[PDB]
Structure formats: structure tokens, C-alpha cells
């Protein structure tokens, strides 16, 4: 593999990708906030599902795109997921607030985004071996960018034309990456036998449950305690600065350790991760608070910026797709499931530090899982036992 | 890869033996790649893995004679220290030192001049 030279445009196309999906993703569920903010309609409950199913389509589909992707190449595949994705974000403008939105916005939506996404972490493993780390760093990197400057490329640089044109400017952004999706030029059921895949998917999906509820409650509870604050929207902006870094250097340092022992990162990273969670009903001053946000960014990106090259080192190239495919669709449910629980208890007791308290323990409990996974050489000798 | 088994011999039914040998030709950086581990053969048997200690430090026994068998390894000084107690009839066997090597998708596994190893009143 050159790992160099040509890559990097695959790497940039990649990028694109990432930010227009996400970014999107964001970018409407702010939107659908907004609308709601003076009037009960524009419907509420379903209103906030629409966002979690869109959302969870990209998880609960990865696996027949996995097959599709094994089965016809990453270019044919992507380029269908940008042209579904464009032509369904297009059809939902045409509807003006019916039922008809929630079926195309979330199921013609998602979808394309989940068809278009596997394949933007597959096809980097091509074109990358000694420097894969750095690759996927960058590409986060970016896409976190992108994600960062699209509101302000929305609100405030136009956004001149009424409401329902908004998903038609969007499109564009899709049918540009549908563009880009042709520069994929290909180089070249029984991964779950392996023990050690096996626990690694289990608990990274154990440790996904108690992921999005800070994302989800850490304003409304700034509110609801430290109403004196003037403005919340630093937290936000510090978290996914602290993020962009992180991600950074840990795509850059993944390449120095050697081997499995990657892993550790992980387990360091969930640990923080927990703790911090737990910490933050504690701390009674904003000056405080402002500190635990930035090491909880810090540790997000640590923690997402590895697992394409983890997968990678686990299964080898030939069987990446597959791998990944797979532990997306394991995570699809505990993501869903964790805002809602912490909601629940938010109304069981009144107070919210129960609903930290509670997302700490997911992290943690995924870490003392990881902990345990076995070593090739151990695998060996278990084998040599089993004789 | 040189190995000397050292002990064996005549013991009595609950009695007490303690194996040991200092890794030969391999200096103690590649041994720290290895993994030590002793093999069992009794008249008729094939050689089999029955005690070993990993990369990681971590032992790990054919649960069948755990507890009554036991090893450590010194990384320090190459040894490795199969300890048996509470021996019995069955165990009789000449036990071989071994050292198992990782390589590019392959492992090397090596033998040492076992002892044999009665056990009888």
C-alpha cells in the first residue's frame, strides 16, 4: 500500500463524507428544536423520534451493507447510498408537515447514509498499513470541523428563504458527495468464531449505552441548576473543540503502540470517561464543570478515533468490512435506548444527578470487560491445552 | 533453544516434587517474547502441554492436575518452577521443559531432555 501519494485524496473525499452526514444529522435536530421552542405542534413526541430513528438507521443497517459492499466493491456501493440519500432528502421538502416526512426523512435518509458510511472507514484500509492510525485521526478530524462550521454556514452565512427550503439546499451537499464517491479505485457468518473479536464487539457495545446522555442533558441541566449562567453554549463549543484534538493526536499516537496493546487506550479511555460522567453532579461551580467537559471531550475523541484500526488489527484486511459491519449493527439498540432511561429517571426522582450517576456505570463496566481480552499467543495456548 | 530438565526421580504417593531448568541458547529479551511450559509423557502417550505461563505474566494449567501441580517463572534469572504436590499413581511420567515462540503468523515449539517421574510406595 503507498500509504502516501494518492491516498490523501481518498482520505480528503472521506472527510466530506463524514461532515456532510453528520453535520446534517445535527444541523435538522436543532432545526426540529427550534420549532418547537414557542408552539406545542410543529407532534412533539413524535417530532423528537423522527431524529432517533433517522439516527438509528445508520446503525441498524450496517450488516446487509457489509454483504452488499463484500459483494460489489466499495465504489458501486457508495455512490447508491449518495444517490439515495440526495434523492430522499430532496423528496422531503415536497412534504409540508405530513406523516409522509417521517417516512422519507427517516427511512430513505438513513438508509443512504448507512449505505454511504461503511465504506468510507472500509476503503482507507486499502490504501493505508503503517500509517492507518494518522489516516482515520485526520479524517475525523475534519469531518468534526465540517460538522462544527455547518450551522454557521447555514444560519448566519444565508438562510435568507423560508423554512422549507432548507432540506432542498442541503441536497446539494449530498449530490457533491455523490460526485466524489467515483474516486473509490479499488486497489486489489464466521467472524464471529474468534473469541477475541467477539469480546471486544461485546463490550465496546456494553460501554455504547451510556454514550449520547451528556450530549443529550448536560444544557438542560446547566439550566435547570445554574440558571445565574448568562449563556450554555460555551460547554458545547469547548467539548467539540477539546474532540477535534483529541481525535488528532490519538489517530497520530495509535501507530506508536504496537500490536493488541492498543486496547489499553480504550480501557484508560472508558475509565476516564466514567469517571468524569460521575463527577460532573458534583462539582457545584461552573468554573469546575467547564473543566470536567473539556476532559470528557478530550477522552471522546481517544475513544472513537480508534476502533476502525483495532478492527483492522483484530481481523486482518480481507475481513474489516464484515467486522465492522457487524459491531455497528451491535450497537444499534443501547444508543437509542440510554437518553430515554436517562429521561425516565430524570422524572422518577426529580433531581437530575440520578441520571449521571447512572450514565457513569456503562463506561466503567465496558472497560473491566475489555480488560480481559485474551492475547493471540494465550489463544495458542488454549489450544495446545485443549490437545 | 537449550533446555536441561533438572530433578525427577522415585516419590512416594502425596509426596512432593519440584522441576526446574534455566533457558540455554536465548537470551533473556527473546525469552521474554517466549512463553515456558513443561510437557508430559507417559509410556504410550504423546507429549502434551500441561502447565505454561504467558507474555502477560499469567499461568495458566491443564485443569485436570491444577492445584496439584503449580509453576512460576523468574524472567530475571530464564527459570521456570514447576512445583507438584499431593502426587499420586497416575501422574508417573517423564516430563520434557519447553519454550514456545511466536513468530509471522507461526509459533516454534521446543524441547528439553525430559525426566521421568514415579510415583509409587
Known amino acids: 500500500p503507498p500509504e502516501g501519494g494518492f491516498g490523501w485524496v481518498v482520505v480528503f473525499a472521506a472527510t466530506w463524507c463524514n461532515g456532510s452526514i453528520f453535520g446534517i444529522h445535527n444541523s435538522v435536530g436543532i432545526l426540529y428544536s427550534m420549532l418547537l421552542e414557542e408552539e406545542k405542534e410543529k407532534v412533539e413526541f413524535q417530532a423528537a423520534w423522527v431524529g432517533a430513528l433517522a439516527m438509528g438507521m445508520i446503525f441498524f443497517c450496517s450488516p446487509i451493507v457489509s454483504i452488499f459492499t463484500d459483494r460489489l466493491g466499495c465504489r458501486i456501493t457508495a455512490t447508491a447510498g449518495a444517490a439515495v440519500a440526495f434523492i430522499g432528502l430532496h423528496t422531503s421538502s415536497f412534504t409540508s408537515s405530513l406523516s409522509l416526512r417521517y417516512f422519507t426523512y427517516g427511512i430513505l435518509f438513513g438508509c443512504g447514509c448507512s449505505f454511504a458510511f461503511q465504506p468510507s472507514l472500509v476503503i482507507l484500509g486499502h490504501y493505508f498499513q503503517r500509517r492507518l492510525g494518522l489516516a482515520n485521526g485526520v479524517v475525523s478530524a475534519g469531518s468534526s470541523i465540517f460538522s462544527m462550521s455547518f450551522p454557521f454556514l447555514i444560519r448566519m452565512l444565508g438562510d435568507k428563504i423560508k423554512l422549507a427550503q432548507t432540506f432542498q439546499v442541503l441536497s446539494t451537499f449530498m449530490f457533491v458527495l455523490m460526485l466524489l464517491s467515483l474516486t473509490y479505485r479499488p486497489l486489489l457468518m464466521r467472524v464471529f468464531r474468534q473469541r477475541t473479536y467477539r469480546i471486544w464487539a461485546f463490550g465496546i457495545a456494553a460501554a455504547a449505552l451510556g454514550y449520547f446522555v451528556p450530549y443529550v442533558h448536560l444544557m438542560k441541566y446547566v439550566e435547570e441548576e445554574f440558571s445565574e449562567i448568562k449563556e450554555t453554549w460555551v460547554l458545547l463549543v469547548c467539548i467539540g473543540a477539546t474532540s477535534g484534538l483529541g481525535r488528532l493526536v490519538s489517530g497520530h499516537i495509535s501507530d506508536s503502540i504496537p500490536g493488541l496493546k492498543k486496547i489499553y487506550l480504550q480501557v484508560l479511555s472508558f475509565l476516564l470517561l466514567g469517571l468524569m460522567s460521575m463527577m460532573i453532579p458534583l462539582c457545584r461551580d461552573f468554573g469546575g464543570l467547564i473543566v470536567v467537559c473539556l476532559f470528557l471531550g478530550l477522552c471522546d475523541g481517544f475513544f472513537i478515533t480508534i476502533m476502525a484500526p483495532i478492527a483492522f488489527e483484530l481481523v486482518g484486511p480481507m475481513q474489516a468490512s464484515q467486522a465492522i459491519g457487524y459491531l455497528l449493527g451491535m450497537m444499534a439498540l443501547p444508543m437509542i435506548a440510554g437518553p430515554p432511561i436517562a429521561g425516565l429517571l430524570r422524572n422518577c426522582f426529580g433531581d437530575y444527578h440520578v441520571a449521571f450517576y447512572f450514565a457513569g456505570v456503562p463506561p466503567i463496566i465496558g472497560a473491566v470487560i475489555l480488560f480481559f481480552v485474551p492475547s493471540r499467543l494465550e489463544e495458542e495456548l488454549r489450544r495446545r491445552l485443549t490437545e | 533453544v537449550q533446555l536441561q530438565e533438572s530433578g525427577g526421580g522415585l516419590v512416594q504417593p502425596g509426596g512432593s516434587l519440584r522441576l526446574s531448568c534455566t533457558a540455554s541458547?536465548?537470551?533473556?529479551?527473546?525469552?521474554?517474547?517466549?512463553?515456558m511450559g513443561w510437557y508430559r509423557q507417559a509410556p504410550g502417550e504423546r507429549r502434551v502441554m500441561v502447565a505454561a505461563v504467558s507474555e502477560r505474566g499469567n499461568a495458566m494449567y491443564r485443569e485436570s492436575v491444577q492445584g496439584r501441580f503449580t509453576v512460576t517463572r523468574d524472567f530475571t534469572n530464564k527459570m521456570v518452577s514447576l512445583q507438584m504436590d499431593n502426587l499420586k499413581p497416575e501422574d508417573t511420567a517423564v516430563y520434557y521443559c519447553?519454550?514456545?515462540?511466536?513468530?509471522?503468523?507461526?509459533?516454534?515449539?521446543?524441547w528439553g531432555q525430559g525426566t521421568q517421574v514415579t510415583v509409587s510406595s
Open positions: 541458547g536465548v537470551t533473556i529479551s527473546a525469552l521474554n517474547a517466549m512463553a
Open positions: 519447553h519454550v514456545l515462540e511466536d513468530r509471522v503468523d507461526s509459533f516454534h515449539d521446543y
